[PDB]
Symmetry: D2
Subunit: 237 residues, 4 copies
Amino acid sequence: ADTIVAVELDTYPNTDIGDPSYPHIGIDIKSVRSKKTAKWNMQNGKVGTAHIIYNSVDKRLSAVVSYPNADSATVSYDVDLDNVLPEWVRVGLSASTGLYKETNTILSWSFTSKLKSNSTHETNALHFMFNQFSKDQKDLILQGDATTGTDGNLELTRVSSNGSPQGSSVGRALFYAPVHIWESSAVVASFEATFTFLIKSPDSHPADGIAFFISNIDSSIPSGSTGRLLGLFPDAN
Amino acid sequence: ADTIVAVELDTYPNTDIGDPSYPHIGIDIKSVRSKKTAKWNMQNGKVGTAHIIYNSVDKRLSAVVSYPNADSATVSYDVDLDNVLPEWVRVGLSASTGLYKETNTILSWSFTSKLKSNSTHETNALHFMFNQFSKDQKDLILQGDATTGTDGNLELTRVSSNGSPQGSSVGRALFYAPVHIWESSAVVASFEATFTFLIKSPDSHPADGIAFFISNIDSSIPSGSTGRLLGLFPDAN
Amino acid sequence: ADTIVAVELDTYPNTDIGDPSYPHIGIDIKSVRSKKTAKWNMQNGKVGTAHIIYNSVDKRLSAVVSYPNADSATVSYDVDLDNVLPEWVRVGLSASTGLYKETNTILSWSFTSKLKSNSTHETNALHFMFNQFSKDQKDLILQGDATTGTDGNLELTRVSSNGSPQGSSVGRALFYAPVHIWESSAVVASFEATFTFLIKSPDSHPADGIAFFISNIDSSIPSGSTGRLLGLFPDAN
Amino acid sequence: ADTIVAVELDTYPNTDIGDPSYPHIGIDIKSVRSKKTAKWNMQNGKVGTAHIIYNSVDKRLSAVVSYPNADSATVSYDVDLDNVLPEWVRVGLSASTGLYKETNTILSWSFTSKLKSNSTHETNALHFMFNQFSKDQKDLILQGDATTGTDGNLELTRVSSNGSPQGSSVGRALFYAPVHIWESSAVVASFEATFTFLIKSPDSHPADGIAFFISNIDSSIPSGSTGRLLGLFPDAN
Ligand SMILES: [Ca+2]
Ligand SMILES: [Ca+2]
Ligand SMILES: [Ca+2]
Ligand SMILES: [Ca+2]
Ligand SMILES: [Ca+2]
Ligand SMILES: [Ca+2]
Ligand SMILES: [Ca+2]
Ligand SMILES: [Ca+2]
């Protein structure tokens, strides 16, 4: 049903569905089998940052993930999103846990979308920046187990009172207003997203990951999308 | 019902309800009887620009209206919006015509809302910029007679095919996502809005005006709000 | 000689020159005797944030200083900077120590200056953001004892190798490009500055303070401006 | 001497030095012989817009030129600017005329430069926007025949009183503050430039072109760089 384009931060290697033998970042185009991946030296307990960029001139969706005092991981993929996604979309964050677990804490999230026309000084733009999430965040659509306000953070997956991450959990957060990614007169369309996250787990093999995604406006969590499916895909096809 | 705060560009003087004997700009706080006004040298057929600013430190809502090659009109009013508006609001543009008419064309509209916390580097923000409106503008809620797409413009009030403005019309456009104007930890909240408009009428006494407003999220056009009520207030009390 | 407008974070009370009997924030207009002050609950060793705003409509220069988990201090002063400062200025940060000392560490510094004309869509702007200072920061003019690069920070005053603040020190940092604060066709001019700082001292009565200032482009540190004069004024008149 | 990277809007085809047989846009890397070009349907007398983008992840310098109501021209080139340009540079606009002439009027110019570190929330940025140039633009370095203020525009090349473009002219405008395009801890560096221009000539074969360029900070107009050399290169090698 849903049309998904996502940049996944996959913490658990499911070699059976294509994942390499280590934590990695990937670019999914309508499938959990990333069309491109890169080795990601994930750090349990540290706060990392993910930057995602794209422009209609280059037609290259790229993402860079980093941790303070460490080398970053980068992954690019040539794709024309006008040929994949509809005109109006909704952007969001998703995460899941399965038998193995982890906290999927989002500490901040910014996003910028620009459509420049052939007309003189004619730019349309949308930009949001969340550095503090409140208990009643009305400009966010929360699905599944996602909640706001706990320490001013976004918890994508269920976390108990003592701070322990629960398993078999799945949650997503989408910005309220639909975003316009294509125009008829647009000479250049672009977008950039940034978000800091904290993945913490008492386990040695944490699972499953966090993903920034772009889907159709009426997108909802597919049934049985916990675990390796990251709350984005209905199956591993 | 609705809580309204608005900056009106009133083209028709209704001396009976408090309006001075000339076109003017005013600041309305829950009443059509502006709590403050300034003489506005309106120009039929020219494109003007309105800038609206406010910050929680100064607690002063100010607006400046200008036309190219002309002196501007300015009006300020000391008001603490935390004591007037709820935490979550929706911003928008409204216009109306009555026996006398005019076109209420919006050529562009930008808005910025910032909430800075006492935390280090903790800003929440929302910013939108419409320089080109399309026929299916999904991130706008259109009410009454407002329509998009005609020449890439927003027509707040009904306009016929030949370009002639209709009377007894009323329309509003609100940004889709609710805006957060107050926090508990906020040390400074601010917002600024800018919009260009074209008021054209074949009449010598055009009516009624355009208004940028901020209301509760479920705000709708009150019954019989055409004419002097600007599509904002149910009565002239 | 120099024309100075400054927002001072005064840590040492010099009751003899007008300072109240406690640490405070003040607004100086060509004199060290603040034309307006507010009690500031300074915290030794904590990182604080100062926000400074001004717009030509309100003609009110305001500043808010805060620390995480604490109430903020605010101070405003009605002043028309067009009547005080020249058309072109340079913005900067200054600090000093005297018999009593403190570190005057600047961890970040952003600044935005806007001039909006009566012309349609005619904004001139300058915006810089320093979150990391390098050893050779070419877009900054360093005067006195100010240095960059140490831990990616700006040290306005001299600090020894072991991290200890030296006395009788004075340093300033100015952005390289002159800023334009007034136009002939401007309908609204505004600026906002933000900077995080760390004041640390082994003493119980730290001195002297940090100040964000705006002066004429060829401004230099006046002789004997260490101590209470904050590196801004030649005398206490 | 000078290290130049430029995006040229070449109006006159000098087939002898590599230029195709028509007006075109090109990307020059230390040579007037563009390493990549695209057909440009130049329009005498119309105002066009040029957008230039680049990011250190993609390592692709792209430019899109357009006119209202027309299809745009685009050209990309894979190049790592860290391997071509020094750490600190100056950005600018240049133009020239020779036997054949044209006006090289710049109506607006914006530029954004960002350096994001691996540190949490650590962005350095510079952004300037000129929509109105004044007679004494202190934040611009003008070289050759470039002048400001005439109708609030930047005239890169000499124009007489009656509005007629002169030949054998050459002028450049550089932003005052040096820009930082590379860091040691940077995970992503990017920049985008936009400028509107008006090329008008009474001739059927106008010459020579306008170029947005990035060079070393002490860059000056090379001798005999009028005509086909665009005020950027000393020779056509
Ligand atoms: Ca996996
Ligand atoms: Ca994977
Ligand atoms: Ca009226
Ligand atoms: Ca009125
Ligand atoms: Ca003092
Ligand atoms: Ca003082
Ligand atoms: Ca040529
Ligand atoms: Ca060429």
